């Protein structure tokens, strides 16, 4: 058991070792070194600014979490914030360092294998830092606050000095989750505004009197964009997956903890717990062990792929990493489930239909759902398949036709993945109730380290190819690096789709956790069916649902406008710099403006439940959560798939798959308009929604202990 | 005595419509060129109507046969009756509009004044308004008398079990059948006719830009006449049928809730079933919505009469707003007395949710009314260039085309919050006053004066056709100025009316969701506490799954419609090229586009009608309740977004055309960007949004009906 608790440190040390191993490889030409120095300075500047703002917000949140609820809650909040920030910083430094070494491998060896290995060892640092830091924080919470302080021992509803009631350990893990959520909100909202403002400004300066090339170091927005790629597909997506991972695990824990007070019967004058402390604690700890086994299998798959004999098929290598981790987790967790829950009593009252093996059936379902959902994102965004081919071909009909067909593509694309989620939820429940729904969220993210490593591979290869083309490298070297960039292009779409699906699953598990956390000491005798209830006929619930949907749409629109404003401001600063390059100057101007913009979306996401709950109650807030989730899922999938389809249709034409037309032609102009429209949608709105749907649920789960009984109307 | 006096009101409205029809027909058509252009337009309209009506009849017969085999035969009879009422209103309104398009221009030319032309156009639109009101309430009065009182379905009010074992309260199921009847007409009009309209508009612009280069606004271009036909197909038949469906849906929901409260609030005192809400109150609440709607129609006729007889003026918007406010205020006042005197001596209103006694539902109704107008205003705030958002979009036109698209999407997304919040507060307060019954009464009050709303909505396209005929006939510049002023006023009223229709659709869809939940009552829940029966638990994984599925289906529905418009447009372009290769063929291309649009609507219509049957026989009534919530939420948001975005794009293009952007005018690059934005937005505002308005209601109606079957007959 202690070995499992050690696995997180193994992953952190693995990250350190891969960091050193890639750092040992050669940087090469001095031109490459200068470009990468620009990139690293921009990245570190952005990181410092955002971490300053993060610390400012986190101290206030921890003080409020200690004043209300308990002090362990605020401590766990800060712990989780630190773990996620650490994973992000480590991954970003590693990526900004490895972007050149990948190109040097490709050039020196004139081969694809060594460059791919360098890039994947680079991304595995972010993957392993995510996994290790997250599960390390969780093990620390489970040991220090969990067993040492006996919060897993009492498992009864505690009433704090203010009168707020809650199960202690549940509230503690909730605080930890909220910490991760703050880190992720900062990363996604802010960094996304920044990244897409930089990309839009890069496109813009090309058309001003400056006549600055897009792929030229003379253009400051080029370096800002190369920094933003890392800010996005390494820090942002990694933090998003980390939040979903921890959310699934915390939801399992909260449901388990609150089942203990739920299933008590007043047989005489005594309250008899129909689910005893043994089973409850076993179910509190089973998710942590499942996730630790997942991290172990992830490290094994990464090891196999980094030591594997070098090959010339990158896509195959990354997919091998994924499938190895998946199957290993499946088998090992099979034995874990069967042996860890075998001798427990009362599992039938918990929803386990086939006994101790029920949740494993749930977990694996998640896994498969995930991969399948991934596939759908690729089907509707790759020009290898029919939809993007049709979109690209329709370019000849005009620009309005490109826009309409892209919107149509996204809207229709939301259905296959939603149906995958629907069947996954139905079957997971069939096996093990809402607990099994949470275990499905976990299984889907059981190998988060490998998923995040493949996600971070993309931007590293993108920067490698960009450095190669900015340094005017040999055409064969450019071919190698561009092939790596295309593989990363496909993996990016798959990873974004997987992240959206994971966010939806974790948000639904958090909704269940919210309902369970509504338990008051006065409902102890009441039948369980009466307490765990959100009635949709209650007009406050319908009203709250409409409100949540509207707030989600408004959130998205505000982010679009913020991106455009920040881009125009960066263009103004670049003009000022030309009249009077400024790399960190423009990077920091845009970073500060994006951080200023983040105030209102963050306040929306965090304060909507507080305001509405203290105003109208916990049924209204349940409605708001359902509306937010239902609209966020759809809008996320839509924006992601539409932007991906537009981008890859432009590529389809640029690759000459549409005879007669190439760069500069009118169809290419139309597709470029479509791609500029979609960039903010896929890289800012979708991920921001992935976060919204979860963080609003977390804030709700926590504050419902207060406003459940403290509401104005 | 007085009851029959009110029951006569529908015939008064139908006769008022006939009289206005005749009065405008007496007006002069004028020049032979105007007569020829209008002959083209009217022939196209009649052709479209006939083609769509054939398919409507086929589907309606299949549905009515199924409604007789299952449930009861009165259900199928009421279904066919409602289909006929709505189809009649649509045909009448469209024929009248195609007739009045010339007489408005003749008023503008002969008299060189705005007042007389406005009067001609408003007398034209009041035909559709009054036909909607009269036909709808006539069908409902007939149902309440024949099946209701004569056959004693308002007398038994107990759960009846049909030969198959399907259980339901008879009158509730009957009114549900009638609602489904109206819904079929509305679905046909909206989905099909909307695909047709936007395919026609897209083909007109394309052929204007194709190798043929046939000028826009030219009789030589057949798609120009097809588009002038589509304006009426959309904002007269489509929008009128939509408002009619929302109206009838609110009323039917009130009735179903009332009917099912009788079995719900029973107490099993030993061996006796004691109805805590007695038959007297149940029947009073079944009939109160009908009388409220009749009073509303009377006030609407009065406002319309005042505005058509009022001293002519030079301010048209003021005249239409006067009609609206008069109808609203009169309905408010009279319905106050109606409520207090009709529900005073009842018993059990407390157990029902009436917080302030017999006057509670009136408080709900008026709220609806205000909600409506406020929602209307919001649609105007986010689409008119008199206000900041559309101004900013137009100004941003200078900064590229991608910026136009991004800012339009942003505008639309943000625009859902003010109107959605209006709906939120309306629901909260309406419920506060009189429970879910009061939510239904709020929907009704919001639509209490539907005749005037539909008349103002149908005014728009008639004036649009008048201005188009004026520009195609090369009329005098002053007459053209008058017609262009009328067209802009019609544009604003169109935006406001579309927004009001969306808000009404959301309110009616929520009332129908409540009706679904009430209709789930089984004979085995007689003793169960009401809290146990009226329950849709959101933790049940089935319900969450169904909600996700419904949202996803709504998005897919929208995307399919977008693609269908382009397919029909491309085919119409091919037909125009063939016509050039071989006075052009007007009805030919109109009928080709109509048949293609009707063939395409088959699949969205099948989605909307069968999704609840498939998913319900598969997984049950909790899953379908989830589906309904997802559909309602996603449809509300997408409807508001698409409508407001299309309106903002169009009115920003107009903002520039008037030179409100110093330095840029027709032909400049910002104008090209705004033209792209408008071509993108046309299908969204005129096809997707309304189709969703329909989806969110018709799926609920089908669910309310079939839940009697699949509630207990489901596979998993």
Coordinates of N, CA and C in Angstrom, one line a residue, chain A residues 402-491:
Chain A
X402 N -18.3 29.1 -46.7 CA -17.3 28.4 -45.8 C -17.8 28.6 -44.4
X403 N -18.2 29.8 -44.0 CA -18.7 30.1 -42.7 C -19.9 29.2 -42.3
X404 N -20.9 29.2 -43.2 CA -22.1 28.5 -42.9 C -21.8 27.0 -42.8
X405 N -21.0 26.5 -43.7 CA -20.7 25.0 -43.6 C -19.9 24.7 -42.4
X406 N -19.0 25.6 -41.9 CA -18.3 25.3 -40.7 C -19.2 25.3 -39.5
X407 N -20.1 26.3 -39.4 CA -21.1 26.2 -38.3 C -21.9 24.9 -38.4
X408 N -22.4 24.6 -39.5 CA -23.2 23.4 -39.7 C -22.4 22.2 -39.3
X409 N -21.1 22.1 -39.7 CA -20.2 21.0 -39.3 C -20.2 20.9 -37.8
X410 N -19.9 22.0 -37.1 CA -19.8 21.9 -35.6 C -21.1 21.5 -35.0
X411 N -22.2 22.1 -35.3 CA -23.5 21.8 -34.7 C -23.8 20.3 -34.9
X412 N -23.6 19.8 -36.1 CA -23.9 18.4 -36.3 C -22.9 17.5 -35.6
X413 N -21.6 18.0 -35.4 CA -20.6 17.2 -34.8 C -20.8 17.0 -33.3
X414 N -21.6 17.8 -32.7 CA -21.8 17.6 -31.3 C -22.6 16.3 -30.9
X415 N -23.2 15.6 -31.9 CA -24.1 14.5 -31.6 C -23.4 13.2 -31.3
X416 N -22.5 12.7 -32.1 CA -21.8 11.4 -31.9 C -21.2 11.4 -30.5
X417 N -20.3 12.4 -30.2 CA -19.7 12.4 -28.8 C -20.7 12.5 -27.7
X418 N -21.8 13.3 -27.8 CA -22.8 13.4 -26.8 C -23.5 12.1 -26.6
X419 N -23.7 11.3 -27.7 CA -24.3 10.0 -27.6 C -23.4 9.0 -26.9
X420 N -22.1 9.1 -27.2 CA -21.1 8.3 -26.5 C -21.2 8.6 -25.0
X421 N -21.2 9.9 -24.6 CA -21.4 10.2 -23.2 C -22.6 9.7 -22.6
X422 N -23.7 9.7 -23.3 CA -25.0 9.3 -22.8 C -25.0 7.8 -22.5
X423 N -24.5 7.0 -23.5 CA -24.5 5.6 -23.3 C -23.5 5.2 -22.1
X424 N -22.4 5.9 -22.1 CA -21.4 5.7 -21.0 C -22.0 5.9 -19.7
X425 N -22.7 7.1 -19.5 CA -23.4 7.3 -18.2 C -24.4 6.3 -17.9
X426 N -25.3 5.9 -18.9 CA -26.3 4.9 -18.6 C -25.7 3.6 -18.1
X427 N -24.7 3.1 -18.8 CA -24.1 1.8 -18.4 C -23.3 1.9 -17.1
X428 N -22.5 3.0 -16.9 CA -21.8 3.1 -15.7 C -22.8 3.1 -14.5
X429 N -23.9 3.9 -14.6 CA -24.9 3.8 -13.6 C -25.4 2.4 -13.4
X430 N -25.8 1.8 -14.5 CA -26.3 0.4 -14.4 C -25.4 -0.5 -13.6
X431 N -24.1 -0.3 -13.7 CA -23.2 -1.1 -12.9 C -23.1 -0.7 -11.5
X432 N -22.9 0.6 -11.2 CA -22.6 1.0 -9.8 C -23.1 2.4 -9.4
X433 N -24.3 2.7 -9.9 CA -24.9 4.0 -9.5 C -24.1 5.3 -9.9
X434 N -24.4 6.3 -9.1 CA -23.6 7.6 -9.3 C -22.2 7.4 -8.9
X435 N -21.9 6.6 -7.9 CA -20.5 6.3 -7.6 C -19.8 5.7 -8.8
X436 N -20.4 4.9 -9.6 CA -19.8 4.3 -10.8 C -19.7 5.4 -11.9
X437 N -20.7 6.3 -11.9 CA -20.5 7.4 -12.8 C -19.2 8.2 -12.5
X438 N -18.9 8.4 -11.3 CA -17.7 9.1 -10.9 C -16.5 8.2 -11.2
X439 N -16.6 6.9 -11.0 CA -15.5 6.0 -11.3 C -15.3 5.9 -12.8
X440 N -16.3 6.2 -13.6 CA -16.2 6.2 -15.0 C -15.4 7.5 -15.4
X441 N -15.7 8.6 -14.8 CA -14.9 9.8 -15.0 C -13.5 9.5 -14.7
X442 N -13.2 8.8 -13.6 CA -11.8 8.5 -13.2 C -11.2 7.6 -14.2
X443 N -11.8 6.5 -14.6 CA -11.2 5.6 -15.6 C -10.9 6.3 -16.9
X444 N -11.8 7.1 -17.3 CA -11.6 7.9 -18.5 C -10.3 8.7 -18.4
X445 N -10.0 9.2 -17.2 CA -8.7 9.9 -17.0 C -7.7 9.1 -16.2
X446 N -7.9 7.7 -16.1 CA -7.0 6.9 -15.3 C -5.6 7.0 -15.7
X447 N -5.3 7.2 -17.0 CA -3.9 7.4 -17.5 C -3.7 8.9 -18.0
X448 N -3.9 9.8 -17.1 CA -3.9 11.2 -17.4 C -2.5 11.6 -17.8
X449 N -1.5 11.0 -17.2 CA -0.1 11.4 -17.5 C 0.2 11.2 -19.0
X450 N -0.1 10.1 -19.5 CA 0.1 9.8 -20.9 C -0.7 10.7 -21.8
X451 N -1.9 11.0 -21.5 CA -2.8 11.9 -22.3 C -2.2 13.3 -22.3
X452 N -1.8 13.8 -21.2 CA -1.2 15.1 -21.1 C 0.2 15.2 -21.8
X453 N 0.9 14.1 -21.8 CA 2.2 14.1 -22.4 C 2.0 14.1 -24.0
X454 N 1.1 13.3 -24.5 CA 0.8 13.4 -25.9 C 0.3 14.8 -26.3
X455 N -0.5 15.4 -25.4 CA -1.1 16.7 -25.6 C 0.1 17.8 -25.7
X456 N 1.0 17.7 -24.8 CA 2.1 18.6 -24.8 C 3.2 18.3 -25.9
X457 N 3.2 17.1 -26.5 CA 4.1 16.9 -27.6 C 3.8 17.8 -28.7
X458 N 2.5 18.1 -29.1 CA 2.2 18.9 -30.2 C 2.9 20.2 -30.3
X459 N 2.7 21.1 -29.2 CA 3.3 22.4 -29.3 C 4.8 22.4 -29.4
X460 N 5.5 21.4 -28.7 CA 6.9 21.3 -28.8 C 7.3 21.1 -30.3
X461 N 6.7 20.2 -31.0 CA 7.0 20.0 -32.4 C 6.6 21.3 -33.2
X462 N 5.5 22.0 -32.9 CA 5.2 23.2 -33.6 C 6.3 24.2 -33.5
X463 N 6.8 24.4 -32.3 CA 7.9 25.4 -32.1 C 9.2 24.9 -32.8
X464 N 9.4 23.6 -32.8 CA 10.6 23.1 -33.5 C 10.5 23.4 -35.0
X465 N 9.4 23.1 -35.6 CA 9.2 23.5 -37.0 C 9.3 25.0 -37.3
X466 N 8.7 25.8 -36.4 CA 8.7 27.2 -36.5 C 10.1 27.7 -36.5
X467 N 10.9 27.2 -35.5 CA 12.3 27.6 -35.4 C 13.1 27.2 -36.7
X468 N 12.8 26.0 -37.2 CA 13.5 25.6 -38.4 C 13.2 26.5 -39.5
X469 N 11.9 26.8 -39.7 CA 11.6 27.7 -40.9 C 12.0 29.1 -40.7
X470 N 12.1 29.6 -39.4 CA 12.6 31.0 -39.2 C 14.1 31.1 -39.4
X471 N 14.8 29.9 -39.2 CA 16.3 29.9 -39.4 C 16.6 29.5 -40.8
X472 N 15.6 29.2 -41.7 CA 15.8 28.8 -43.0 C 16.7 27.6 -43.1
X473 N 16.2 26.5 -42.5 CA 16.9 25.3 -42.5 C 16.8 24.5 -43.8
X474 N 17.5 23.4 -43.9 CA 17.5 22.7 -45.2 C 16.1 22.1 -45.5
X475 N 15.7 22.0 -46.7 CA 14.4 21.5 -47.0 C 14.0 20.2 -46.5
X476 N 15.0 19.3 -46.4 CA 14.8 17.9 -45.9 C 14.5 18.0 -44.4
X477 N 15.3 18.9 -43.7 CA 15.1 19.1 -42.2 C 13.7 19.7 -42.0
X478 N 13.3 20.7 -42.9 CA 12.0 21.3 -42.8 C 10.9 20.2 -43.0
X479 N 11.2 19.3 -43.9 CA 10.2 18.2 -44.2 C 10.0 17.4 -42.9
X480 N 11.1 17.0 -42.3 CA 11.0 16.2 -41.1 C 10.2 16.9 -40.0
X481 N 10.6 18.1 -39.7 CA 9.9 18.9 -38.7 C 8.5 19.2 -39.0
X482 N 8.2 19.4 -40.3 CA 6.8 19.7 -40.7 C 5.9 18.4 -40.6
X483 N 6.5 17.2 -40.9 CA 5.8 16.0 -40.7 C 5.4 15.8 -39.2
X484 N 6.4 16.1 -38.3 CA 6.1 16.0 -36.9 C 5.0 17.0 -36.5
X485 N 5.1 18.2 -37.1 CA 4.0 19.2 -36.8 C 2.6 18.8 -37.2
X486 N 2.5 18.1 -38.4 CA 1.2 17.6 -38.8 C 0.7 16.5 -37.9
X487 N 1.6 15.6 -37.4 CA 1.2 14.6 -36.5 C 0.7 15.3 -35.2
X488 N 1.4 16.3 -34.7 CA 0.9 17.1 -33.6 C -0.4 17.7 -33.8
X489 N -0.6 18.2 -35.1 CA -1.9 18.8 -35.4 C -3.1 17.8 -35.2
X490 N -2.9 16.6 -35.6 CA -4.0 15.6 -35.4 C -4.1 15.3 -33.9
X491 N -3.0 15.1 -33.2 CA -3.1 14.8 -31.8 C -3.7 15.9 -31.0

